[PDB]
Amino acid sequence: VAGHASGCEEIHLAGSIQPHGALLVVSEHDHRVIQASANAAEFLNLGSVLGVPLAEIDGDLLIKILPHLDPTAEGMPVAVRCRIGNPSTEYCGLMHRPPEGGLIIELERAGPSIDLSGTLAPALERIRTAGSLRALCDDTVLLFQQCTGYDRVMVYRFDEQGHGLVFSECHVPGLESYFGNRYPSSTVPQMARQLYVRQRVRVLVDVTYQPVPLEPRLSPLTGRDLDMSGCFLRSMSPCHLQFLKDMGVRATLAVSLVVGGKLWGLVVCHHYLPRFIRFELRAICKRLAERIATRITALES
Ligand SMILES: *[C]C1(*)(*)(*)=C(*)(*)(*)(C(*)(*)C2(*)(*)(*)=N(*)(*)C(*)(*)(*)(=O*)C(*)(*)(*)([C])C2(*)(*)(*)[C@@](*)(*)=C(*)*)N(*)(*)C(*)(*)(*)(C(*)(*)C2(*)(*)(*)=C(*)(*)(*)(C(*)(*)C(*)(*)C(*)(*)(*)(O*)=O*)C(*)(*)(*)([C]*)=C(*)(*)(*)(C(*)(*)C3(*)(*)(*)=N(*)(*)C(*)(*)(*)(=O*)C(*)(*)(*)(C(*)(*)=[C]*)=C3(*)(*)(*)[C]*)N2(*)*)=C1(*)(*)(*)C(*)(*)C(*)(*)C(*)(*)(*)(O*)=O*
Ligand SMILES: [Cl-]
Numbered sequence: 001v002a003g004h005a006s007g008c009e010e011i012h013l014a015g016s017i018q019p020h021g022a023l024l025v026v027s028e029h030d031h032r033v034i035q036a037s038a039n040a041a042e043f044l045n046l047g048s049v050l051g052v053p054l055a056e057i058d059g060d061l062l063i064k065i066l067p068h069l070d071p072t073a074e075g076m077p078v079a080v081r082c083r084i085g086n087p088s089t090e091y092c093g094l095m096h097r098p099p100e101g102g103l104i105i106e107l108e109r110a111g112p113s114i115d116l117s118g119t120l121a122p123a124l125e126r127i128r129t130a131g132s133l134r135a136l137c138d139d140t141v142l143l144f145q146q147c148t149g150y151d152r153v154m155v156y157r158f159d160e161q162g163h164g165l166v167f168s169e170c171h172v173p174g175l176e177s178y179f180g181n182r183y184p185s186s187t188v189p190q191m192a193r194q195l196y197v198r199q200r201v202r203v204l205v206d207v208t209y210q211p212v213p214l215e216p217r218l219s220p221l222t223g224r225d226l227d228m229s230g231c232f233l234r235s236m237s238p239c240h241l242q243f244l245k246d247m248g249v250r251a252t253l254a255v256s257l258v259v260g261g262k263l264w265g266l267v268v269c270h271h272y273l274p275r276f277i278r279f280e281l282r283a284i285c286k287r288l289a290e291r292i293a294t295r296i297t298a299l300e301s
């Protein structure tokens with residue numbers, strides 16, 4: 001198709017995911033899958049997925065999520081551990097409910113317990129006793145690097161006009177240093193900063209990925225695009241991916257620092273090969289970011 005009609009987006013309405021997980025959307029009157037990422041049946045080792053009742057999916061997903069489905073104030077979002085498919089694989093399933101559109105379950109392959117409590121006790125002490133923002137942010141990048149193994153870790157700070165600053169940095173020997181560089185606010189646009197106040201960790205596994213569309217794209221329950229604000233698998237803005245490609249970065253982890261309800265900064269990690277961190281380690285990063293934000297609050301008071 002050509003002609004005139006043929007031929008800086010609402011990032012939370014991406015309609016697609018990154019390929020290192022599967023996404024199911026479930027209607028809760030009948031507990032059937034009403035949307036799924038196009039890769040779901042392959043990824044989960046299932047013959048079919050769309051339209052299938054959870055009870056009929058090979059494995060124990062339904063039994064595992066049942067205890068968390070009734071309304072509760074201390075409930076979702078919540079992660080469960082289950083087995084799915086034939087051949088059966090273990091998964092971690094992250095569940096949340098968008099405002100409308102049903103119940104979202106995002107599934108990643110499970111791995112072993114991560115045993116970082118002995119690293120964490122002293123990390124927490126270093127955080128709670130940091131005497132300045134300089135000290136705190138320097139310790140932050142070191143701690144994150146140790147925990148996560150990324151080739152570069154930065155604290156990226158926002159000012160009141162939204163401009164960005166690389167306030168702290170560590171990196172593997174021999175790499176480029178971005179320490180102290182400034183960037184325009186347009187590089188992390190307002191709608192993205194607002195999203196990051198609600199969705200506190202983002203992982204981009206491979207910047208060169210091909211997005212995996214939701215099928216159907218539009219929610220059967222709303223007739224609108226699915227609100228993917230809370231989706232950890234959400235596909236990321238092409239404009240941002242191009243930015244990272246032009247720097248040669250292959251993978252990223254970002255963790256929000258939220259102070260007084262505002263996005264104060266990000267812990268931003270780069271890797272020069274594809275990289276994924278699983279749910280348990282993401283949870284630790286989030287706990288660390290809350291501890292750091294508490295200390296920023298005190299230091300700024
Ligand atoms: C839509 C969107 C953009 C847009 C965008 N970036 C640009 O460079 C231009 C001016 C414009 C359009 C192309 N940027 C971002 C996100 C973004 C983040 C947050 C990433 C994350 O994983 O949470 C960050 C940290 C940056 C900028 C940088 N990252 C770096 O490491 C460095 C420098 C060392 C910079 C400057 N941009 C989005 C939203 C992406 C999404 O879908 O969540
Ligand atoms: Cl529903």
Ligand SMILES: [Cl-]
Pocket residue numbers: 054055059060061062063064
């Ligand atoms: Cl079951």
